[PDB]
RNA sequence: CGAGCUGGAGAUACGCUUUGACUCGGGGAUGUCCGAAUGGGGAAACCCACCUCGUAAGAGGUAUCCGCAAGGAUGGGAACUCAGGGAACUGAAACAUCUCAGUACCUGAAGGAGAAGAAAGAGAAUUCGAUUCCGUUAGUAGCGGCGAGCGAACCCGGAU
RNA sequence: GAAACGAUGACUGAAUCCGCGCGGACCACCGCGCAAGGCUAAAUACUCCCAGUGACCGAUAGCGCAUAGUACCGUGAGGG
RNA sequence: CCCCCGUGACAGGGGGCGGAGGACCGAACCGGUGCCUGCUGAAACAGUCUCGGAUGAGUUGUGUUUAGGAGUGAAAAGCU
RNA sequence: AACGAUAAAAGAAGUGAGAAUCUUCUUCGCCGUAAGGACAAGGGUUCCUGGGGAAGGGUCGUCCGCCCAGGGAAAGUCGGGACCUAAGGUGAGGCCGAACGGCGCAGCCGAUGGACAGCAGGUCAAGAUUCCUGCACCGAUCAUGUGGAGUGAUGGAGGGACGCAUUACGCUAUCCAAUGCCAAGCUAUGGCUAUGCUGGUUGGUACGCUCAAGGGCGAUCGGGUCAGAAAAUCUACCGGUCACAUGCCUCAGACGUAUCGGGAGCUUCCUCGGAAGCGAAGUUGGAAACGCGACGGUGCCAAGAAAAGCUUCUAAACGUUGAAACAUGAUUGCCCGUACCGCAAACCGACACAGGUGUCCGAGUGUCAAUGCACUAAGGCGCGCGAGAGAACCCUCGUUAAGGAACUUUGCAAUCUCACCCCGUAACUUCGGAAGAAGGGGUCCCCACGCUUCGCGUGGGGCGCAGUGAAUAGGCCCAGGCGACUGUUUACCAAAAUCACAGCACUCUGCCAACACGAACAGUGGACGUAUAGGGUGUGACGCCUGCCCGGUGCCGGAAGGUCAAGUGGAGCGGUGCAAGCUGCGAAAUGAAGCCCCGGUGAACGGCUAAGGUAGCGAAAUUCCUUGUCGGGUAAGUUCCGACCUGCACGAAAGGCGUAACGAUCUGGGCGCUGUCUCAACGAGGGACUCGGUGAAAUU
């Protein structure tokens, strides 16, 4: 427990509620976690400890740089306490090392990957995830994202060797209700158990099931949502 | 509501046929044997306090 | 201005008035705190500062916007004026055009008035000749699910 | 609507006297006027305030108020 | 966590000790299930008896935020 | 009719024009985790004193929370402000916007939280950590001495910084006992005679090689450039050195001495009852916090504010003759709140309303325990109409012959049960549970004996009808529907089979994500997250499962060709003029998405012509005919259980079938008990009736 900014609940913006549900809590805090990890490249550090922190589902490594400063950094599946972390293109592609893709061996399974030089990590970071490399092209690398997708990425971007783990939300069965309350307000409210007024799947004497749409009028099963833009060219194989 | 309720205002008359029975009976005062003021039979004379002798204080 | 005055108050006491009170006119001087409010905070009238002038008491400045600078602006006005935005009931015996209306309401700006104004005009006489207002033309020309219904201008008279 | 002209958000984009606009699509002819700078009394409107008047009222009338937006009601706007 | 017994795939069972739980009984507290009462009420929704919950998705104070076709809603078209 | 809870009241005495209703005394009764006490908020003067006697006070009133007048409230340290920051509010300069205006970093405002200097008493009619008395502490400013030198920021670091449950040890507040101590007297009814009875039985401060559990702890040297923007004699990291034990540092509290106060009562005057002066003892034993020691120990996951004060550290800086710091004096101390009510006739409820209100204190005895239950201290109060009567009927209670659910829509209601020991306890089961299952026994008093003590066991004895002897205080069981479960809901007729839920499934979403709020290429929420994530929809523990039909609609993908907008493209047609020219109309082809079209997809709409019901269940909460038919239980069953099947109109995630456990759920049965009932009776209290006081309503 140490050196972290305070987090405050809030499930809606300026005026009213925006992202339904979510209201419970516990008071959790925020721990600034190094993602971009460049200003520190060129300095070795050791796993002082792996603390378990919320707002993440992902162990947290408390690294210490020769500089003297500490910096929490996601903990990949494997690092024990006391090992070594080193940033900068000059780094043995091992667990915890952060080295851009250009310098990353094909078939190498890494996470914490960015999408644009800096602004921190972005892909592969949530509890146990693995984005492996496919095979450099020109300036961009082909990689496989946890959703089974293929995106070019200019190898200019660092990455962390290895895959996160923090065990696995597989046996975590949240027991009975109220565990969800240890986190977010009573989940989903069956709009089919509301009123013609309140939502599309309202009324009906008895029990319904027609039209299939979201709280508003769109459709939820198999209706595309992404639009026509840039990244679009920079992408390969959305479906599946 | 106020369930039973009257069907019509009652005559000033009717209303009086009624009260033909509310007339007080004046006491039947007796005259105290001593101070001679009037008294209430079987009670003590409030003016002298007697009832043969003087029971109540002056 | 000349016997009275001492507010409404209807009371007592003290008093003040020709070196003319009082009252009426007309200028000054005082004018705590809040309020655009503007030293800073503030759930109005409270709470806290600072710099300068200084006997200390006490005085004064300390807001933002235009401008060297004087100096101007922020606020408030019953209705009237123009502007930006602009309903519906209702009618059409229903209703979507259309009507009710660009009315009601909101907002901005302004003054005692505004707005408008000195013609790339109106008109059919090779006429009038800034703008505005009243009369008339006329409910005519025309607009209109050519339905409900809406409705000019020129000329001519008059304010100026 | 055959529907001109005025206006403007969006694209465009002219001339200048043997020049320019319009006169209800459009053309010629005929005709009236010169746009893209400006300021301007006066007659016009209203009425918080003031005076005068009234085939206006005269106290359940007349303003809500012979005075009070008070008492009273409302968290409040507000009503009164 | 510490001791004793057991074995054919089977386990576990036992004693200490620990102190878990949208665990149990139950008062404050939160609720309001059934009956009577009360309906010109003590009360514009209550009382008595009875009952539900009782470390939990718990109960509550202060400050603060969301509103009208709008907010809020463990969802009755409920509350505002 | 009512006079606002059935916590009662009696007498005496006093005042007065007049008193059930005011005051005094003496009794009675009610509350006592409160109907006592202290605040908060809210209200304001309601507080105190003297008057008053219209109206208000459900009745009187000589009285009052009402009317009149006067008085009362006192803080360097208690709360707040001149200090801090959270949500949130605001916001120069910035981002947006038809207007008004909408957002927004720093900064600022903003407690309900942080920080911070006092205690013990006395006492006005009415105030008190505010006034007095005693002793104390904090800051500030000056003087004096000491000192002998730096002082050290709107900056760095350290720190303030923080959860839930459970738990060891020491202690206190506080409470209990005694042939302890002090004080006062008296005692009689039969006795006691004091080893009886009543009452009191220490708070602050200062010192003490005194006792004392518990609690806290690295310092130092150096290294490195890459860290704290920078700087550092600070902080972090690296390593060296001693960091067993320990050791220190600190002491909750106790004890002793001193001293200051208080202390049951005593005495005196008295204008009637206060005033004044004085004063004893302070023991041993026992219990004990939700507090103190302390930011203690262990365990747990859902993983538990910020900011200033503070500590150290430099920058800059004036200064190293006169510094910072300590001490001893002195002077100094601002604004606001502090009365009274405050779980209630003083606040919210139109009423002095049976309601609503946050926090704290909350004694004793008995009872495993307790903030339960009974009685009761302190203290507070008998509820602002009263008296009689003793009928009908109504409400709230007590008992009830014989019977025992015959009542009735339903055992609705009301009984029975009812605590704590011991013994004993089924099906079924996810092996937890079903269980407090079911059933049976004990329970008081004395004495001896032994025990771990309060307490308890063993034996003997005793008394009653009866011994959790009075109050608190489960009725039990079989079977079925529904829902798994705890939970949630129609404030004021529905609590449930509703909703939610853990679990499952489909699908969308590549991150300025899908999605949503918004005037807005602003801002923001999703998320300071990133696909084992977030959104949406449906299903709803667990278990075995979950079929057939993509014709139609939708969704995805395919995609030749057909069709389709503006626009591009200018022929063809017409106008005017003399003419050049200027002007109307208007194709071919070409031209986006989409629509037609091809295939696909059911835990998509949906159906069982595109197919026709795999399993499982079945007259079921989904069956019409219907009280179907047989069986069950009953003397007798339209209901209920089990089968069958002819499923009017079951059926597999609008989920099918089952399932331990759970239910103020719904249904049927049984045991026990009972006034539910055959039939009601008697009794009680509170109305109803009567008299005195006050005195409505709907209706007409
Ligand atoms: Mg008259
Ligand atoms: Mg007036
Ligand atoms: Mg109970
Ligand atoms: Mg229960
Ligand atoms: Mg009586
Ligand atoms: Mg069944
Ligand atoms: Mg249920
Ligand atoms: Mg429940
Ligand atoms: Mg009477």
Question: Which helices and strands, and how do they pair?
Answer:
This is part of a larger assembly, with chains A (240 residues) and B (58 residues).
Chain A lengths: L43 E8 L8 E6 L4 E5 L9 E3 L22 E3 L19 E3 L6 E6 L3 E6 L5 E2 L73 E2 L4
Chain B lengths: L13 H5 L11 E2 L6 E2 L19
Antiparallel strand pairs in B: 1-2
Chain A binds four RNA strands through β1.
PDB class: ribosome
Keywords: ribosome, large ribosomal subunit, 50S, Ribonucleoprotein, Ribosomal protein, RNA-binding, rRNA-binding, tRNA-binding, Methylation, Metal-binding, Zinc-finger
Entry title: Refined native structure of the large ribosomal subunit (50S) from Deinococcus radiodurans
What does this 3D model show about the protein?
The structure is cut from a larger assembly and holds chains A (240 residues) and B (58 residues). In chain A, the strands form two sheets. Chain A has a five-stranded antiparallel β-sheet with strand order 5-6-7-8-10, with no helix packed on it. With 240 residues, chain A is mostly beta strands. Chain A contains no helices and ten strands. Chain A is globular and about 70 Å long. Chain A has two domains: 86 residues, OB fold (Dihydrolipoamide Acetyltransferase, E2P) (Beta Barrel); 154 residues, no CATH class. In chain A, a hairpin with a 3-residue loop joins strand 7 and strand 8. By secondary structure, chain B is largely without helices or strands. Chain B has one domain. Chain B is built from one helix and two strands. Chain B has a two-stranded antiparallel ribbon with strand order 1-2. The chains hardly touch. The structure holds magnesium ion (MG) (9 copies). Chain A binds four RNA strands through strand 1.
